[PDB]
Structures are given as C-alpha cells and as structure tokens.
Amino acid sequence: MGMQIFVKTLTGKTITLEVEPSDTIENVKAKIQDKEGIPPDQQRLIFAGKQLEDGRTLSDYNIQKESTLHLVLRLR
C-alpha cells in the first residue's frame, strides 16, 4: 500500500522505490533492475546487518514505511 522505501547504492545514490508489504525480495530486485539494469542474481539487500532472502517478504522482516535498504553486489 502506497509506501515508498529507499535503497542506497555503494556510490551514495539513493534509489526510491514504490512497494507493498506483500512484495518479495525477489521482486524488489526486479524493481531495481528496472531502474539500474543490475541483474537480480548479483543483487544483495542489507537491513540491520541482515542480507534479505528471496522468497521472504518485506512484512516478514517487518520493514516498515520508508526504511532504507543497502545494496551490495555478488557474482558468486
């Protein structure tokens, strides 16, 4: 519902996203690919020291409105 969250790149760029609590992490990376072209398989999202798993949802991490995620990349 209605809610935005922010995603910080390693360059200092803040990417703003439109999301629902029911959205998975897998499709938030979809959200990110759409803006930055980074393939979801190399994306990694960090919140409170945790790397969020694909197939869980924003609600299971209780990520509330306007929380800022941190992006890191991994090939392998």
Binding site: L10, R44, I46, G49, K50, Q51, V72, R74, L75, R76
Partner: protein, 168 residues
C-alpha cells in the same frame, strides 16, 4: 598528505552516519592509520547478543592501496584466517576489487555480506567451509557449525563486561 585528510573525512562521516552494528574509533586519537571496530551480532541470527572486535590498518598511500582488516576476536568462518585476517576480494589488488574510489563504508558493508553469505568457492579456511556447506546442504539438521558459533558469541560477554560495553 592526502591520506590523513581522506581518513579524517571518512571517520567523521562514519561517526555521523554509522553502519548498523559497527562502531568506529581510533586506537589512539592522533593516529588515523589504525582504527578499532566494535561489531554487534544482529538479533535472530546465531550471532545474537554477541560483541566482536576488529582492527583496521591503513597504508601511507590510502586510498591507492587497500588497508588490512583483522579480527581481534577469534572467529570461525570460511573466509577468516587463523590470525583473524579477512580474505575479501575488495581488499586485494568488479566493485569487488580495490581501486582509489573505494572506501571504508564500502568495506564494512562488504564484510556484512560476507558474514551473511560466505565465499565457499575460494575459502581461506576450508574446514569451516566444509562444515558450513554441510550445515547448509542438511537444511539445519546438522548443528556442528552453529554450536561453535553460539559458544564464541557466549564467550564475548566476558569481553563486553571487561570493556564496560552494554550490548543492545
């Protein structure tokens, strides 16, 4: 030198905006090339409640040459040596290898990633690597890896009490 200005800047920016679960301080104020890292394991992980200590050492030419990251606390982990040295690609000569654009905030975030998801392809400790892969492949049925993690964590409470730090 550009080093000393560069380091002083990343310090103020790291203290004005910490990386969650990391605290940055100088070993001795008036030396900027050596730092102390206080590290708090996150809730709902096996590192829960734990307090960890590491040090960073910066070369004369930073940020042209990468610094060294070493744990004072003893850590069992596929990418951590016996000495406490972290093996992480971005600290050796894409955004995963060292170049003058890189910085401390980036290193930290990269280590969190490595704490979460070890590099089992090119590990520095393959006993821990084997054990981790076994823990993973068994869907949690094997407790050998996790029991070790719990114990070290439980041990850190002595370090906290000894340092006077209250663990949130």
């Amino acid at each position: 030198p550009s080093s000393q200005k560069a380091l002083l800047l990343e310090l103020k920016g790291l203290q004005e905006e910490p990386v969650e679960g990391f605290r940055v301080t100088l070993v001795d104020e008036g030396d900027l090339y050596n730092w102390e890292v206080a590290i708090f394991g996150p809730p709902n992980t096996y590192y829960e409640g734990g307090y960890f200590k590491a040090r960073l050492k910066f070369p004369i030419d930073y940020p042209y040459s990468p610094p060294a990251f070493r744990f004072l606390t003893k850590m069992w982990h596929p990418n951590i040596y016996e000495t406490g040295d972290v093996c992480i690609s971005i600290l050796h000569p894409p955004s995963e290898r060292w170049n003058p654009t890189q910085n401390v905030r980036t290193i930290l975030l990269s280590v969190i990633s490595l704490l979460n998801e070890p590099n089992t392809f090119s590990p520095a400790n393959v006993d821990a690597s084997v054990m981790y892969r076994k823990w993973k492949e068994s869907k949690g049925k094997d407790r050998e890896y996790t029991d070790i993690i719990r114990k070290q964590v439980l041990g850190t409470k002595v370090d906290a009490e000894r340092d006077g730090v209250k663990v949130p």
